[PDB]
Amino acid sequence: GSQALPPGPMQTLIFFDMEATGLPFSQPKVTELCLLAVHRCALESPPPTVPPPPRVVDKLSLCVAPGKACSPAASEITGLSTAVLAAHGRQCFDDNLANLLLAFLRRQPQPWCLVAHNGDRYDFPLLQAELAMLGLTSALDGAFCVDSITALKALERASSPSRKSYSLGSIYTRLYGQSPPDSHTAEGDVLALLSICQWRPQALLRWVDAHARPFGTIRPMYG
Amino acid sequence: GPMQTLIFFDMEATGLPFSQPKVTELCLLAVHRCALESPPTPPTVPPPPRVVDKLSLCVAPGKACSPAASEITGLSTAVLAAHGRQCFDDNLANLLLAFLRRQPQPWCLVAHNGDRYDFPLLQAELAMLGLTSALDGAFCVDSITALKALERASSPSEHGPRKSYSLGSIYTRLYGQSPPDSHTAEGDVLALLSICQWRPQALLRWVDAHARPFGTIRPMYG
Numbered sequence A: 001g002s003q004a005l006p007p008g009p010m011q012t013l014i015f016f017d018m019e020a021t022g023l024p025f026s027q028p029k030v031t032e033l034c035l036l037a038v039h040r041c042a043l044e045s046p047p048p049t050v051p052p053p054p055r056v057v058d059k060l061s062l063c064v065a066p067g068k069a070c071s072p073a074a075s076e077i078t079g080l081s082t083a084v085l086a087a088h089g090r091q092c093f094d095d096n097l098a099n100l101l102l103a104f105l106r107r108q109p110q111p112w113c114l115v116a117h118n119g120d121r122y123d124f125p126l127l128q129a130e131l132a133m134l135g136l137t138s139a140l141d142g143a144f145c146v147d148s149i150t151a152l153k154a155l156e157r158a159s160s161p162s163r164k165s166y167s168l169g170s171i172y173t174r175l176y177g178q179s180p181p182d183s184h185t186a187e188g189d190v191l192a193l194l195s196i197c198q199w200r201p202q203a204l205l206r207w208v209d210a211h212a213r214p215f216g217t218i219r220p221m222y223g
Numbered sequence B: 001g002p003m004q005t006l007i008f009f010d011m012e013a014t015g016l017p018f019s020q021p022k023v024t025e026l027c028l029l030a031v032h033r034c035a036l037e038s039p040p041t042p043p044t045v046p047p048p049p050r051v052v053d054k055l056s057l058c059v060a061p062g063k064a065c066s067p068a069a070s071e072i073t074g075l076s077t078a079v080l081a082a083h084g085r086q087c088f089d090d091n092l093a094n095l096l097l098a099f100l101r102r103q104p105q106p107w108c109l110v111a112h113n114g115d116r117y118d119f120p121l122l123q124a125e126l127a128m129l130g131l132t133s134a135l136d137g138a139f140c141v142d143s144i145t146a147l148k149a150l151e152r153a154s155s156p157s158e159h160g161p162r163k164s165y166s167l168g169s170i171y172t173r174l175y176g177q178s179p180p181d182s183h184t185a186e187g188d189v190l191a192l193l194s195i196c197q198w199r200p201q202a203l204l205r206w207v208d209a210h211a212r213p214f215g216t217i218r219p220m221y222g
């Protein structure tokens, strides 16, 4: 057989979050997503308390009509409800949304690595479920992905001897001694994750290069 | 009739129009009419609505930025190439249209000095790709024309030298401080959003009345 070319070093980190109508057991639907694409050089080749975002970034932030009610807890946490999303004329997760995500990713040099906090439990399998419901199961087979919880635990352990919270808020406070702005909004969470990842970016890129998984290996949450 | 989506819009470029400039950066921020008409029920500056769609992209211009452009925007052709940015291409044109198609029509692009800068340069970039018709479904308004019209209708007739309608000048007159960010396309779009949230009902009436089809904007150059 002809073997896969090793992807080599990740050229684009896409910091990624979605918010949903509820918890995975509910078979939730997407209400919000944010992608923030950073070139490797912005982390390999960059003093304030919280480092600023790189000047050169690509960002996409969209609200989505979920087509079912949000749980009360989900609405209180995210400040979104199905009724308000409908008052803002939001459209459901559709072929046009999938086209827009791929067009955005195609502006970035490959290989692409999606980086999401609790990506494996939440954002990655929900995105795969949304794409599977459109019959677009292969849409992101080109991409790599990392759960930043997995990455940051392995960095912490590697930079530790023999339990701390690994909530996005918790890690951020340990590093920076303040809460992140606009928490539990997709863009707020992506900006907080970027800030955490600019802490020891060389160590993070080494880990991402070694452990990035083809997105196609992520099974949909439901279906 | 009533615009359903206001898309606050800014591009940055390699230089001023006489230089036949190329896009280096663009930001679109789509707000539903109701976000301006009926904001949630004060701070010195109104907050942005919770429900927004946002797109912010850097573009490889294919030529050098002027020293003044680089200084004002903090971008250069060398830095954009270091970050592996792609030129203004069919994929970008498709991305912009797919973003607008998330929004209910009618669409109104709102850009500060849009008639001299952002609109004609956007039409120039689309025309050089052979995509002259791509965004002619949209309407557009130059916020300078809008704010001037509102101010004329809310002041005695002007005499002697006129005030600056720079983005910074308008922001400072209203809010008594500089915008948070004066160096990025996204910063300029958020500052314009804040300015347009000052008298949003009077602004929407004017927009509803005076919005132009984007297809009537001639390219900055051929």
Ligand SMILES: Cn1c(-c2cccc(Br)c2OCCO)nc(C(=O)Nc2cnoc2)c(O)c1=O
Binding pocket: A017, A018, A019, A020, A021, A022, A023, A024, A028, A071, A073, A074, A075, A077, A078, A121, A122, A123, A126, A184, A185, A189
């Ligand atoms: C805070 N929070 C929560 C969350 C945490 C605890 C309790 C609730 Br209810 C949460 O959901 C709030 C709505 O997303 N969930 C997600 C999330 O991606 N949930 C998904 C994805 N796919 O299926 C479920 C977040 O990004 C987030 O910031």
Ligand SMILES: Cn1c(-c2cccc(Br)c2OCCO)nc(C(=O)Nc2cnoc2)c(O)c1=O
Binding pocket: B010, B011, B012, B013, B014, B015, B016, B017, B021, B066, B068, B069, B072, B073, B116, B117, B118, B121, B188
């Ligand atoms: C500050 N500034 C200026 C600007 C003002 C004075 C001097 C210079 Br040099 C400027 O250009 C800086 C690079 O965009 N120009 C634009 C602009 O849209 N220029 C375009 C668009 N199409 O052709 C030229 C801005 O958005 C902006 O905020």
Ligand SMILES: [Mg+2]
Binding pocket: A017, A018, A019, A122, A123
């Ligand atoms: Mg999430």
Ligand SMILES: [Mg+2]
Binding pocket: A017, A018, A019, A184, A185, A186, A189
């Ligand atoms: Mg989140």
Ligand SMILES: [Mg+2]
Binding pocket: B010, B011, B012, B117, B118
């Ligand atoms: Mg501009």
Ligand SMILES: [Mg+2]
Binding pocket: B010, B011, B012, B184, B185, B188
């Ligand atoms: Mg500007």
